[PDB]
Design a protein around this ligand. Sequence first.
Ligand SMILES: *[C@@H]1O[C@H](CO)[C@@H](O[C@@H]2O[C@H](CO)[C@@H](O[C@@H]3O[C@H](CO[C@H]4O[C@H](CO[C@H]5O[C@H](CO)[C@@H](O)[C@H](O)[C@@H]5O)[C@@H](O)[C@H](O[C@H]5O[C@H](CO)[C@@H](O)[C@H](O)[C@@H]5O)[C@@H]4O)[C@@H](O)[C@H](O[C@H]4O[C@H](CO)[C@@H](O)[C@H](O)[C@@H]4O[C@H]4O[C@H](CO)[C@@H](O)[C@H](O)[C@@H]4O[C@H]4O[C@H](CO)[C@@H](O)[C@H](O)[C@@H]4O)[C@@H]3O)[C@H](O)[C@H]2NC(C)=O)[C@H](O)[C@H]1NC(C)=O
Ligand SMILES: *[C@@H]1O[C@H](CO)[C@@H](O[C@@H]2O[C@H](CO)[C@@H](O[C@@H]3O[C@H](CO)[C@@H](O)[C@H](O[C@H]4O[C@H](CO)[C@@H](O)[C@H](O)[C@@H]4O)[C@@H]3O)[C@H](O)[C@H]2NC(C)=O)[C@H](O)[C@H]1NC(C)=O
Ligand SMILES: *[C@@H]1O[C@H](CO)[C@@H](O)[C@H](O)[C@H]1NC(C)=O
Ligand SMILES: *[C@@H]1O[C@H](CO)[C@@H](O)[C@H](O)[C@H]1NC(C)=O
Length: 513
Amino acid sequence: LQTKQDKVLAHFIGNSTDYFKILDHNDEFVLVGAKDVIYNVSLNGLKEIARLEWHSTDADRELCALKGKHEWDCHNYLRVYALRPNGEVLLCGTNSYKPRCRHYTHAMRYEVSRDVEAQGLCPYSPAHNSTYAFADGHLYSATVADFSGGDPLIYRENLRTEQYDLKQLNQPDFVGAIERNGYVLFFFRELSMEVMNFGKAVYSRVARVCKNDRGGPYSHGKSWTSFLKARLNCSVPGEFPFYFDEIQAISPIVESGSKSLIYAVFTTSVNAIPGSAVCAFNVDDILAAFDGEFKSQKDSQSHWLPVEREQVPKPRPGQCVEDSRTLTSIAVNFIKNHPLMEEAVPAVHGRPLLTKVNLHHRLTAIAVHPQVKSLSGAYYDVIYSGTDDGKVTKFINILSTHPNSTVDRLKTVVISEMQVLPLGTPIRELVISTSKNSLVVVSDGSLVSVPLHHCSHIVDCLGCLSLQDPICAWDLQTHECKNLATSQHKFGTKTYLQSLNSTKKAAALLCPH
Ligand SMILES: *[C@@H]1O[C@H](CO)[C@@H](O[C@@H]2O[C@H](CO)[C@@H](O[C@@H]3O[C@H](CO[C@H]4O[C@H](CO[C@H]5O[C@H](CO)[C@@H](O)[C@H](O)[C@@H]5O)[C@@H](O)[C@H](O[C@H]5O[C@H](CO)[C@@H](O)[C@H](O)[C@@H]5O)[C@@H]4O)[C@@H](O)[C@H](O[C@H]4O[C@H](CO)[C@@H](O)[C@H](O)[C@@H]4O[C@H]4O[C@H](CO)[C@@H](O)[C@H](O)[C@@H]4O[C@H]4O[C@H](CO)[C@@H](O)[C@H](O)[C@@H]4O)[C@@H]3O)[C@H](O)[C@H]2NC(C)=O)[C@H](O)[C@H]1NC(C)=O
Ligand SMILES: *[C@@H]1O[C@H](CO)[C@@H](O[C@@H]2O[C@H](CO)[C@@H](O[C@@H]3O[C@H](CO)[C@@H](O)[C@H](O[C@H]4O[C@H](CO)[C@@H](O)[C@H](O)[C@@H]4O)[C@@H]3O)[C@H](O)[C@H]2NC(C)=O)[C@H](O)[C@H]1NC(C)=O
Ligand SMILES: *[C@@H]1O[C@H](CO)[C@@H](O)[C@H](O)[C@H]1NC(C)=O
Ligand SMILES: *[C@@H]1O[C@H](CO)[C@@H](O)[C@H](O)[C@H]1NC(C)=O
């Protein structure tokens, strides 16, 4: 008991073989894609509401086992859900390495409207290496097209990345896909070509495609004409920067004031000492990287600089043209030859928001409660991160202006680090329901509900101030640590105490004797 165990509110337990995956969630209900089943689960008590079962035919499982896969692989793990603009429901599952998609239509309705192949639209294995995004009525999938797992692609409406071309994709493991401003952004880690000796170094990338892409002319009609990617830069600055090059998870786009943010979790490679980090990226900075120079093709010398400014095609590559079929073969071949941008995307504040180095666990999940108003009146993003150990870490960031020198100092206020899952089980995903004050930890075979904020669970004044949660404040009128977002303060907060910009011992000093 070196770390305290968190107060588990509710639990939804399945077998370890289930390999749960969250498909859709809001503040009240969440969908869980599992082995042969997808679950509609209410968030107040983690109680099941609606169940849809879908099993592989014995013909499908037999051929799957004949294909050389084990029993746990020869099932139907549901991995793709989308609410179509017709009110229909789209469901796709692995189906024992024979992926298929279906359309569906108090009261539970389960009528199979359609059933068709899902090659390139759905993964073959429950492995969490692939992602998707349903944007403007189409499915933008990033997965493998083959049974062996050696043909990665990004696909949508018969438009795919170049097959067996390592310049666009080099053994990628996808971690997420976000729609934004007429683009679809993909986040993944892959092998690096830009290194001089082509060494097996993993780099983290953000890639984008135009949604209005209609392909190129002639043989380019089945390939993207707007595929670009840039490296993500999550590193500790210095004379010798310390990089976290393997992205592991991302959060949805967070709205923090006038800025749109994406929080991501990075780990170090196997050689550098084991390390984890949380970096945030500005969406305006991500989109700006695709306005820069193009990294030239890895020529034999490999010391080549970015492409000459006069060598880029007449319209800029990656710019969403109305009809991309009118583009020339020279312009389409160019963006196929130079899909990698020269400059990398810088992280917000130019450094990780949290680092974890030389520890017996790595960060795995991420979730954000944005713009929590502190007692003082400032707004902070409360960031949640999970580990392969089963722990959850709350923290906020405070940036100091001229505290000692003109250089700004960014500090990390760790709110709590508690054990949530059994000490062995890793944390796959994190879902936040602010209205129910619930953080839902997701493992392979369980959902666990723990309080999003422990204001109502602490009774001591010293603990209410030492917690340094921007949402918990201590009322002196009534000895009760109150939640500023949920609890009602009709008599005002003038008698409240909170200290976020101090030491955890300096905060408890403000608390009365
Ligand atoms: C992801 O994001 C991260 C975070 O943002 C990025 O991280 C960056 O990483 C790069 C490298 O990848 C770093 O570049 C190095 O920067 C430092 C510092 O440069 C600044 O400061 C210089 C002056 O500092 C010195 O002088 C002042 C007084 O003048 C003194 O007070 C101070 O104490 C200090 O002593 C400036 O000169 C420099 O400005 C220059 O560059 C500007 C930008 O181009 C330009 O605007 C200026 O006009 C000017 O041209 C800047 O302000 C540098 O130390 C370092 O320089 C080394 O590397 C280059 C590479 O070609 C080389 O040409 C240099 O000669 C130098 O190489 C020596 O140092 C190496 C470092 O140890 C050493 O390994 C070498 O062997 C070599 O050493 C030889 O000479 C030295 C004596 O000089 C001797 O000790 C050796 O034994 C040997 O004889 C780099 O420029 C960035 O700092 C870093 N950024 C941050 C914010 O941390 C990362 O790039 C991003 N990744 C991606 C993919 O995007
Ligand atoms: C998982 O479980 C929850 C719990 O039931 C479930 O949430 C429910 O969603 C349905 C919609 O699918 C909600 O029912 C709607 O209520 C609105 C009232 O505003 C009605 O207008 C809706 O009618 C629709 O269809 C009509 C024609 O058929 C149209 O005229 C109309 O415009 C609507 O389009 C519909 O009755 C229901 O309120 C919630 N339940 C709760 C408690 O909120 C969820 O759908 C389940 N499945 C998932 C998430 O896939
Ligand atoms: C979970 O595994 C057990 C094996 O001990 C099995 O009996 C049970 O049926 C499984 N769960 C479901 C929902 O089938
Ligand atoms: C995930 O997809 C990549 C894409 O190339 C593939 O190489 C890999 O085998 C798949 N599975 C895992 C576990 O990475």
